[PDB]
Amino acid sequence: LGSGIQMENSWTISKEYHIDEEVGFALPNPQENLPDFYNDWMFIAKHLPDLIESGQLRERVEKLNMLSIDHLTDHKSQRLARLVLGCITMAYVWGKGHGDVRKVLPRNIAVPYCQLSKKLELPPILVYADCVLANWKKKDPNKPLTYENMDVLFSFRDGDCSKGFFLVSLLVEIAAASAIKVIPTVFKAMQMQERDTLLKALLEIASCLEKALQVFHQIHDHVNPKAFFSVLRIYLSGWKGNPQLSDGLVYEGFWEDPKEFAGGSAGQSSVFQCFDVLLGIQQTAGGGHAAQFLQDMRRYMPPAHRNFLCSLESNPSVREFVLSKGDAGLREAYDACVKALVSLRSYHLQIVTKYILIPASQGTDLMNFLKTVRSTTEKSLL
Ligand SMILES: C#Cc1ccc(NC(=O)OC[C@]23CN(S(=O)(=O)c4ccc(C(C)(C)C(=O)O)cc4C)C[C@H]2C[C@H]2C[C@@H]3C2(C)C)cc1
DSSP states (O other): OOSSSOBSSSSSBOGGGOOBTTTBTSOSSOOOOOOGGGHHHHHHHHTHHHHHHTTOHHHHHHTOOOOOGGGOOSHHHHHHHHHHHHHHHHHHHHTTSSSOOOSEEOHHHHHHHHHHHHHHTOOSSOOHIIIIISSOEESSTTSOSOGGGEEOSOOSSTTSOHHHHHHHHHHHHHHHHHHHTTHHHHHHHHHHTOHHHHHHHHHHHHHHHHHHHHHHTTHHHHOOHHHIIIIIHHHTOOSSSOGGGTTOBEETTTOSSOBOOOOOOGGGOSHHHHHHHHTTOOOOTTHHHHHHHHHHHHTTSOHHHHHHHHHHHHSOOHHHHHHTSOOHHHHHHHHHHHHHHHHHHHHHHHHHIIIIIHHHHOOHHHHHHHHHHHHHHHHTOO
């Protein structure tokens, strides 16, 4: 207990962390279909665009029967059901996105959704782990994980660019997986004092984070800024600090009082903090207020991924190891990882500017947090 990353064997981290060697934090080969028993749920989730557009969604949810979650017997089926019910819930609350909101989630969604969220230790609102990490398939199983060979499972509105936004995000996560699988090698090389093994491990991580950033560049080709800001972002909005639901949402039949849960945040992806921790970068941007927000978003990650991040912080310090040596190869390799991270943060800042800050105009605290985490990262260059 408390001795850093648990291992399944001499090569691979513990399966308890639910990190896949091929897709990383993403869920491997997600389930696309629920048991027959939940067909009515699947129908609504598959037809969300035309049900919202026609004004039919809320009545159709209001006519659902209460389905027990007992027939969701494995992790993949529970994650698919969370995605389905999360999408239905966002669509039910926000409707067409023009301010006609519902403040009471009907019990025939609220209860199984809340029970399932309790099993998975995730809040009962859509999170990154649902709409990106489990929200995909290959078109052709025998072809590789590329944009052209992939699709999402659920969208909110036709033209909302959710395929572009979610798949490009997923593909960045998959690119980062090639870096994550090297982490045990880094710490093994430190224990063994294997200079070359550590060096090549850091070069491989740096190379995979460079590639992940080139995947991120694809967002511009599949997401229209106006459609993202004025349409998709509605359905990723939550009811924590939201003046449209100032007390939260009533989960009918689960809690008596309304409850607040936060909407999507880039802070729900584990990738940034994973490599900040590995490399010993300590983010300071935004003070205790940003730390509390970002820790709360950590509780919106799958619990096993939280435990991975927390075990990482207990391992020996890579940065301190490289700092204990007059070794230019190690310093340059460490620096390549940090530079790749700086570039990923710098690009993050540019995307927030083009896809949120600019549309909004057509705020200041967000642009300066992104600038500050970028300069904190840059100041970690050894
Ligand atoms: C529920 C849910 C929900 C929760 C989270 C997310 N997305 C997310 O966590 O993505 C991580 C990213 C960051 N972006 S992003 O384009 O900068 C980005 C991400 C998220 C937003 C949202 C819509 C939440 C917002 O604030 O309005 C806005 C923007 C501009 C993409 C992705 C790629 C790289 C940079 C990291 C990455 C390392 C993997 C989507 C839905």
